[PDB]
């Protein structure tokens, strides 16, 4: 029906290959069928914009088939709106500033402390993964090590949400959720008590006030903070520091002027996105110009196919934090489901990188050890590096 393509599981030492591959595909056809994802990938900007706006035709009901069933992302319409308002409260600008001052700045200093006393470290495992894990730890009131133990299971959960037609991926996702249910239940039970003094405690109290604090709803709060708050945020941090390490003159500008960090992060989401976009379910036969999609089909909206559009972003292969306006991020989705955690993720990248750059004026990539980039790095559902080895001192 649509041309066949292999857009995702392709390794390269070039961080731009992923973005370039999606743009080139979009130039050849508006929709491709990906041989690994097993579903159509929409690449054309106008079609993606139509799809994000029309939730009656492009739903998230495919999440009712997997481990997110019962959670926010699987909800539609008014049910979705009501729970979305609860989540929104916890990610308002002032709430985020409060997390920055109370939790994220001190944690970032502690994570950077642990890198001291070593000539070289891997910023992927030792920084990019560590910081978001410890922030979620703080939100749960549980030791970050307990989350560290779930890494394989977390990635197994996510792989089956994306490759949802692959029986091995779906089975491993459901099994991994089963194998994490004890920890999730323990966290919910403790922070459901009147003695809770954690942010998760506050979220569960708000659900209780709305008579929404079912067993399933409370487990799904915890699940969403793990999958988005820990794992997915790690790769944004990783890709931003890679972009700076790969462009030493820009890294030096940003250490001398930390007010440039928001720009470095936004341009990094364009230049080296950690995500392609979203999944949607076609709810009724629909025509997109001369393209036809059948009711029941699950699709990917690959919003990042526009990142390397040279009419929009001249010299798109250049990491340029001076672009104006800054590029609109495509990694958080769109429409009514646009990532509710995005303010926290953006703030963690800024505060974490600020602490790292201030602490290590000599920071530089290990010249000899080039990272390899792929969608699916380390069995994740992210486009990112396999390692970020650095030298910390001159
Ligand atoms: C770089 C970091 C992150 C990326 C790239 C990301 C990406 C995404 C994407 C693509 C979606 C689906 C949007 C759609 O269907 O339109 C999403 C939804 C969601 N994310 Fe994030 N996420 C990140 C961090 C976070 C964090 C830190 C949290 C929580 C603290 C979080 C919680 C959620 C939730 C609850 C939803 C479902 C929203 C809804 O369906 O209304 N995510 N995220
Ligand atoms: C590939 C990627 O990074 C994106 C594509 C679809 C996104 C997900 C969509 C659903 C979702 C809802 C949550 O509550 C947590 C985050 C998640 C689990 C998202 C994580 C990141 C994902 C997996």
Query: What does the DSSP assignment read for 294-334?
Result: -TT-EEEE-GGGGTT-TTTSSSTTS--TT-SSPPPP-TT--
Instruction: Give the pairing of strands 278-282 and 286-288.
Output: unpaired
Tell me the β-bridge partners of 365. Answer: 390
Which domain CATH number covers 92?
Answer: 1.10.630.10
Whole-Å CA distances, 315 to 15, 201, 320, 323, 325: 15, 48, 9, 11, 15
Residues 6+ apart with CB under 8 A from 23: 305, 306, 307, 308, 309, 316
Residue 327 neighbours by CB under 8 Å, 6+ apart: 266, 267, 269, 270, 307, 312, 313
CB 375 within 8 A of CB 18: yes
Measured distance CA(25)–CA(35) in Å, rounded: 14
Give the resolution value in Å: 1.8
Total domains present in the chain = 1
E-strand ranges in 4-136 read 4-5, 31-34, 39-42, 58-59, 120-122
- The tokens of 169 are what? 């991926």
Q: Tell me, in angstroms, the distance from the centre of ligand 2 to residue 110's CA.
A: 28
Cα(101) to centroid(ligand 1), Å: 23
Q: 332 CB under 6 A from ligand 1?
A: yes
Q: Which of 52, 58, 90, 341 to mutate to test the pocket of ligand 1 (most atoms within 8 A of CB)?
A: 341
Q: Cβ of 189: how many Cβ atoms within 10 Å?
A: 10
Tell me, in angstroms, the distance from the centre of ligand 2 to residue 305's CA.
Answer: 18
CB 274 within 8 A of CB 168: no
Query: 22, 7 in Cβ contact below 8 A?
Result: yes
3-state secondary structure of 41: strand
Domain residue limits at 164: 1-394
């Amino acid at each position: 029906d649509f041309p066949l393509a292999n857009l995702f599981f392709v390794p390269s030492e070039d961080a731009t290959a992923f973005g370039r591959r999606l743009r080139a595909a979009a130039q050849q056809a508006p929709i491709v069928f990906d041989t690994a994802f097993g579903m159509p990938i929409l690449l054309r900007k106008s079609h993606i914009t139509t799809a994000y706006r029309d939730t009656a035709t492009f739903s998230t009901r495919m999440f009712q088939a997997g481990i997110l069933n019962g959670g926010l992302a699987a909800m539609q319409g008014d049910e979705h709106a009501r729970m979305r308002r609860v989540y929104n409260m916890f990610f308002l600008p002032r709430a985020v500033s409060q997390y920055e001052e109370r939790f994220v700045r001190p944690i970032s200093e502690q994570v950077v402390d642990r890198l001291a006393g070593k000539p070289r470290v891997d910023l992927l495992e030792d920084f990019a993964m560590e910081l978001p894990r410890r922030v979620i730890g703080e939100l749960f009131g549980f030791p970050a090590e307990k989350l560290h133990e779930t890494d394989e299971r977390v990635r197994a959960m996510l792989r089956g949400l994306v490759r949802m037609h692959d029986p091995a991926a779906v089975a491993e996702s459901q099994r991994a959720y089963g194998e994490t249910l004890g920890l999730i239940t323990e966290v919910v039970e403790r922070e459901s008590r009147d003695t809770s003094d954690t942010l998760l405690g506050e979220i569960l109290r708000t659900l209780k006030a709305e008579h929404m604090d079912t067993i399933e709803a409370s487990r799904q709060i915890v699940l969403s903070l793990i999958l988005g708050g820990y794992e997915t945020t790690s790769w944004l941090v990783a890709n931003t520091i890679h972009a700076l390490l790969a462009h030493p003159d820009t890294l030096a500008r940003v250490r001398q002027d930390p007010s440039l960090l928001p720009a470095a992060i936004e341009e990094g989401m364009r230049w080296c996105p950690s995500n392609f976009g979203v999944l949607r379910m076609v709810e009724r036969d629909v025509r997109l110009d001369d393209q036809a999609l059948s009711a029941g089909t699950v699709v990917c909206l690959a919003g990042i196919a526009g990142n390397y559009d040279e009419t929009a972003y001249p010299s798109p292969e250049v990491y340029d934090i001076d672009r104006k306006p800054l590029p609109a991020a495509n990694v958080f989705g769109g429409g009514a489901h646009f990532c509710v955690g995005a303010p926290l993720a953006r703030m963690e990248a800024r505060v974490g990188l600020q602490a790292l750059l201030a602490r290590f004026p000599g920071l530089r990539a290990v010249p000899e050890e080039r990272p390899s980039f792929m969608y699916g790095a380390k069995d994740s559902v992210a486009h990112g590096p396999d390692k970020l080895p650095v030298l910390l001192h001159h």
